[PDB]
Design a protein around this ligand. Structure first.
Ligand code: V10
Ligand code: FE2
Length: 329
């Protein structure tokens, strides 16, 4: 009934290297995908995703109810007032099926200047007990740096794509201060699956999460090989095919702002599927004070009628609004 979205597979491996011409050919593919459905799969990305899925599986299946309250964000545990972003997002059996664990920059330590200042959107990660989840924290922190690496490469391709030098975005994306996050989302198999956990789209499609744009510069997403995502195009919502060997890449609304909608943030939603699966996004966020002057690559002088917006401002408003629009996750 629903047709397949154009989601090209792009070999992003020249973005790690020093062959400048070959990086420009990748840039072009990124430009094309970004002007069309707004999604592509990055292939030859160098990350061991089957291990990521295994380590993440072992965590989700072995965390206990007790641990979840102990790690819970403020929205679920009012004792944990500093936990706005990072920690455990509980399901509600009978009502909200999905659950997840979010963590931030491992460099956000108690001595970090932004943590000392108590700056919004900066928090110190919470972790389960090492003896109960041996290896998990070190694996997860390592994953953050491996996906950080991929995202830097990708941001070099988007820079080149937009007619900029390759460091245009990446110079704002730094280990010591990035607001980027990993979310380890568990979608369960449930029998019976509670209707209260299923939303219905205007067109009748059963959904786990409604239409939205991403709160990010770009999103770098690993998921299981279970089809679920749809993207709105001028021909209506189209199905994004699953590929659990690549990363699904799209632009968030920060990119749309900077480029004056030359690279739109694609509107997408998550169909309801009764399957035990994973969705493991990395939201590529810049630094709290990062400001890029907005521009327009469709205009001869490159000038835009949008005003500069600091990443920190964008992020804190965005994440609130997303909760308001689509509910607490
Ligand atoms: C967990 S609800 C459904 C899930 O959607 C999301 O994670 C949505 C849309 S991309 N994103 C968010 O809720 C933002 C999480 C931001 C994160 N907690 C942070 O602090 O960075 C999905 O796409 O499967
Ligand atoms: Fe999304």
């Amino acid at each position: 009934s629903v047709s397949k979205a154009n989601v090209p597979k792009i070999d992003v491996s020249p973005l790690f290297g020093d062959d400048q011409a070959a990086k420009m050919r990748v840039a072009q593919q990124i430009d094309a995908a970004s002007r069309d459905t707004g999604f592509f799969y990055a292939v030859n990305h160098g990350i061991n995703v089957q291990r990521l899925s295994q380590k993440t599986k072992e965590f989700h299946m072995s965390i206990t109810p007790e641990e979840k309250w102990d790690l819970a964000i403020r929205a679920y545990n009012k004792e944990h007032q500093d936990q706005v972003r990072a920690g455990y997002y509980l399901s509600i059996p009978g009502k909200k099926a999905v659950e997840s664990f979010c963590y931030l920059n491992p460099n956000f330590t108690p001595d970090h200047p932004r943590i000392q200042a108590k700056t919004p959107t900066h928090e110190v990660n919470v972790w389960p007990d090492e003896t109960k989840h041996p290896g998990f924290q070190d694996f997860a922190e390592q994953y953050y740096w491996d996906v950080f690496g991929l995202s830097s490469a990708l941001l070099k391709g988007y820079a080149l794509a937009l007619g900029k030098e390759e460091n245009f975005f990446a110079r704002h994306f730094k280990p010591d201060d990035t607001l980027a996050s990993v979310v380890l989302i568990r979608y369960p198999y449930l029998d019976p699956y509670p209707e209260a956990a299923i939303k219905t789209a205007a067109d009748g499609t059963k959904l786990s999460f409604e239409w939205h744009e991403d709160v990010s510069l770009i999103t770098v997403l690993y998921q299981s090989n279970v089809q679920n995502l749809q993207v709105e195009t001028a021909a209506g919502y189209q199905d994004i095919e699953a590929d659990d060997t690549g990363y699904l890449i799209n632009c968030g609304s920060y990119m749309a702002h900077l480029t004056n909608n030359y690279y739109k943030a694609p509107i997408h939603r998550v169909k309801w599927v009764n399957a035990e699966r994973q969705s493991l996004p990395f939201f590529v966020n810049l630094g709290y004070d990062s400001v890029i002057d907005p521009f327009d690559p469709r205009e001869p002088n490159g000038k835009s009628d949008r005003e500069p917006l600091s990443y920190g401002d964008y992020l804190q408003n965005g994440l609130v609004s997303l909760i308001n629009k689509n509910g607490q996750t």
